[PDB]
Amino acid sequence: LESWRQLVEIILTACPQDLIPTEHRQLIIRDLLQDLHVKILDDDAAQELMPIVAGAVFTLTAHLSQSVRTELKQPMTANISAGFASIGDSSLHMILRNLLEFILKTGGGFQRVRAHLYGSLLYYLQIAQRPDEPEDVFSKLQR
Amino acid sequence: FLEPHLVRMAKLNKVRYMDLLWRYYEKNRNFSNAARVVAKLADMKQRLEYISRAILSAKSSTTMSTLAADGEFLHELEEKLEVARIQLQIQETLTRQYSHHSTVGDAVSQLDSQLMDITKMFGQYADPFRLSECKLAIIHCAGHSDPILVQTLWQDIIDKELSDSMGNSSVDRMQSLHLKITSLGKIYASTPRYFPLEFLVKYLEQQVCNFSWDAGFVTYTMQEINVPVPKLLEVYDHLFKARDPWWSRMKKPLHLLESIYILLSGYVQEPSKVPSYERRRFTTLCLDAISCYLVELQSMDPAPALLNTVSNFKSLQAKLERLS
Amino acid sequence: ILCSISCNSKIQEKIVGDFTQDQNVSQKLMVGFVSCLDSDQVKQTNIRYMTKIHILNLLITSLEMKAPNLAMFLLGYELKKPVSTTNLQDSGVLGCPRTCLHSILDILRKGTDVRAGPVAVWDTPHLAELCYQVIYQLCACADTSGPTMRYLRTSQDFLFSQLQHLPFSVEESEISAMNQMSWLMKTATIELRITSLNRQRSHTQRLLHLLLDDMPTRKVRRKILRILDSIQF
Amino acid sequence: MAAQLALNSEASLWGPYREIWQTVLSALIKRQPEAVHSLDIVLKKYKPDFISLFKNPPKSAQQHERVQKASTEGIPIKGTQRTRILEEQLIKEAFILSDLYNIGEIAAVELLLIGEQQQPTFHGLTRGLVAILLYWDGKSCMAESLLHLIQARKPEVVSMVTRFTDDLMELT
Known part of the structure; x- marks a missing residue:
């Protein structure tokens, strides 16, 4: 695992x-975070x-924050549904639900x-702060 | 230049040329090319000689070589030889039958002139002549398994032999039939698919009851083709217990009983027929069979012959007990 | 006895001086070692097995301690010149004897579906860890750093053929299968790091294209994910 | 010259001696059933080798007019891995040393080029003397092959192997 990681x-x-x-x-980062979360939330590990x-x-989310900080930069030259297409707000919550699960399981010993x-x-959450003006669905995301 | 001279001439006494070619090849360590040239020749009465020569030359090509393709070609040449042989014997037969059939001669020439495919051969040589033995051989080689077909073929062989043997004396007919059956069986002895024991035995016994022949004939024939005595006894017992009303209708159930008795007596007189390590159990089985037979004989209305048979069976039982 | 001598440290220098004193002595003894690794008969293979082990353990311990040491003489390295400037060549090419480099290369090359597998079944390296360490020390000590990696990449295509096998299915010892992937991961890691520090795009492309493009070409799970699913917790 | 080009095809010349061994090594030592299926083609395509290892045939002065002059018209080695135009010292090894254990000029080079491969690869052995060793080593594997073939002969094909070894025993 260490080697792999x-x-x-x-x-x-x-x-x-x-x-x-x-x-x-982002699709690769998506599947990697899903499989990771699935394995760690088990009660036999x-x-x-x-x-x-x-x-x-801690590493993959740091790259994801830079990935979406890039998404807020890159407009579509290659019809306005190509920036948030692969992001997924449901995946942003599924990642969040798995993250809150791992914080619950983690005892005070594992600082x-x-x-x-x-x-x-x-x-x-640096993804959720507004550098530019997503607009309303981002607002309800904090809600 | 000898080699290319030969090749060119053979392509353009082609047989002679290619024979010389293959000889030179084998001497010069080129038997594979010898083979290829010979097979090309084969493919390309005079044709009868060509076939004989082809066979000889391919045998020379692959002495030990198991080259799949060439080995299969040699097997096909042996099967082509099979074709030739069966064709000629059966042609003699049907020729002498239909006032020296001219059509038989024509068909033989056709079969020697070119190699035929299974379907064609079957169809054609069936309607005018019905070569059941040949058909059986053909299917055996290919691997086609049709029990019904095999049985029908066997029946037809026997019937044709009988039609041809009507002219001969009963004894001669019997002997000829025996020989033919034995020979054909020895060919397909290993394969039970192409030798339907139960059917054959039943049909032959029926024919015996119809033509009034000897009771022990079938038993002797089967012992001669190395059919184990235990197995033959099993078959007979099964036929008996099937209660086929055919025997009752032919007024001969006692005949079948006496045939079983003859088989058993033959075993007792020469116990070496059964293997030494199986003798005791076989004797016990015979003792049981004898008991049941006696019980049935006693449930039937008495007759002098019946009583004689009962006494014989009891004596056999005593002898078997002494043996065990 | 050879492995017991290696137990202490500075003797490596004196041992090499003895082996390489005479040209006939250096050759016969080194190549005598090689042919012995190119393995009644039940105890012949067993002894041929333990011989391989005692010879591979000897090469490890002697390697970590010193350079140039005994390992430098055996692995076709030149000692009259600094180890960093050796030109390693294929067995036979330009009078080059089949060395302990060319020997282990042949060992791994034969698609190790053999029953023997890696001799680490009860012990240390899967003999990939040794190669991956000699390749590693070459870069770390800058001794023939380029040559080891260059050769492996151009002459054998060793990693691309080895990493395609993905999860090794040794249920006999899941300790062994996990270790085989462990010592193989630490190597593919440093390999792609250094190739990318140079400018090789064609090599880097093909490598990373394979590892990541799970998309079925000519839902299939990624090769990197199938490894993770083979690690039960 | 226009005479040996019309010979359309034949399997191989000395590649067999190596291809058999790898096919025999795979069928017997490696135990592959799809190899023994191909072995039903190899075992006896190369029967003249298992019969007579390093065999000989017949050579005469007419074959000298086929090849004309080896120097002027290069001898046709129908197979090679390293190109090497051959000298006058090889013709004198063709006429003389082929009247002996009988390798043959074209087979004297395939032996040297095999010896040239393991000239420094095998320890302390020079070209000409490596060729003498790999010539006896190829037959030892040619006979060790034949042994391991017969040791197996006593599970399906065992009845095919036994029946064919009986006929061969049935030569002596």
Whole structure:
């Protein structure tokens, strides 16, 4: 797991953004976060998977915050439904529901886990702050 | 230049040329090319000789070589030889039958001139002549399994032999039939698919009751084709317990009983027929069978022959007990 | 006895000096080692097995300690010149003897579906960890750093053929299957990091294109996700 | 010259000796049933080798007029891996040393080029003397192949293998 985790994190983040479809980049980040959340929320996985999945979470959400901070920048030259298409507000909540689940499970002992999710929490919320003027569905998202 | 001279001439006494070619090849470590050239030749009375020569040359081509393609070609040449042989024997037969049939000669020439396909052969040589033995051989080789067809073919062989044997004395007919059956069985002995034991036995016994022949004939024939005595006994017992009313209708149930008795007596006189390690159990089985037979004989109205048979069976029982 | 000698440290320098004193002595002894690894008969293969183990454990321990040490003489490296400037070549090419490099390359190359598998079944490396460490130390100590990776990439295409197998199904020891992926992940990681630090696009493209494009070409789960599902918790 | 080009095709020359071994090694030592299906084509396409390892035939002065002059008109080696125009020292090995264990010029090069492969790869052995070793080593594998073939002969094909080894035993 450690090996896997480090490999994935390093390589994925180290890529110099050569992938042309950003939708596919966000789709990849989507499936990765789903499978990850599914495995960690099990009751038969003791603290062994507590920090190593925590380390992976803190990294993938940090790249996602930069991915959506990029989404608020890149207009559609390649009919105004191509920016939030692959994002998914339901996936933004499903990720949130899985994240709140892992914070509940994490006891006070696993501070490192709570530390990697709290930082993963805010990076999800720097997505919700308005740099430019999404408009109303973003407002209800905080609600 | 010998090699290309040969090849060119063979392409343009082609048989001679290709024979020389293959010989030179084998000497010069090129038997594969020898084979290929020979097969090409084969494909390309005189045709009868061509076939004999083709066979010889392909045998020379693959002495041990198991090359799938070439080996299968040699097997096909042996099956082509099968065709030739069956055709000629049966042609002799039907020729002498239809006032030296001219059509038989024509058909034989056709069969030797070219290699035929299963369907054609079957259809054609069935309607004018009905070559059941040949059809059976053909299906055996291909692997086609049709029990009904096999049985029909066997029946037809027997019937044709009988039609041809009507002229001969009963004894001669019987002997000829025996020989033919034995030979054909030895060919398909290993394959039970192409040798329907129950049907054959039943039909032959029916024919015996119809023509009034010897009771032990079938038993002797089956012992001769290495049919185990336990197995034959089993078959007979099964036929008996089936209560076929055919026997009752032919006024001969006692005849079948006596045939069973003859089989059993033959076993007792020479116990070596059964393997040594199975002797005791077989003796116990015979003792049980004898008991049941005796019980049925005693449920029937008495007659002098019946009483004699009962006494014989009791003696057999005593002897078997002494043996065990 | 050879493995017991290796227990202490500075003797490596004296051992190499002995082996390489005479040209006939350096060759025969080194290539004698090689042919011995190119493995009644039940105890012959067993002894052929334990021989391989004692020889591979010897190569590891001697490697971590010192350079140039015994490992440098055995692995076709030149000692008269600094280890960083060796030109490794294929077995036989330009009079190059089939070395302990070319030997282990042959070992892994044969699609190890063999019953033996990696000898690490009860022990250490799957003999990929050794290669992946010699390749690793080459880069770390800058000794033939380029040559090791360059060779593996151009002559054998070792990682692309090895990483395609994805999850190794050794249920005999899920400890072994997990370790085989462990020592293989730490290597593909440093490989793609350094290739990308250079400018090789064609190589980098093909590699990352395969690992990620789960989309069925000529729902299939990603190769990276199938690994994760093979790790029961 | 226009004479050996009309010979349309034939399997191979010395690749067999190596292709058999890998097919025999795969069918017997590796235990592959789809290999023994192909072995139903290999075992006896190369029966003249298992009969006589390093066999010989007949060569005369008319074959000298086919090849004309080896130097002037290059001998047709129908197979090679490393190109090498051959000298006058190879013709003197064709006429003489082929009257012995009888390898043959074209087969003397395929032996040297195999020896040239393991000239430094095999320890302490020079080209000409590696060829002498891989010639005896190819037959040892040619006979070790034949043994392991017969050891198996006593589970389906066992009745096919036994019946064919009986006829072969049935030569001595």
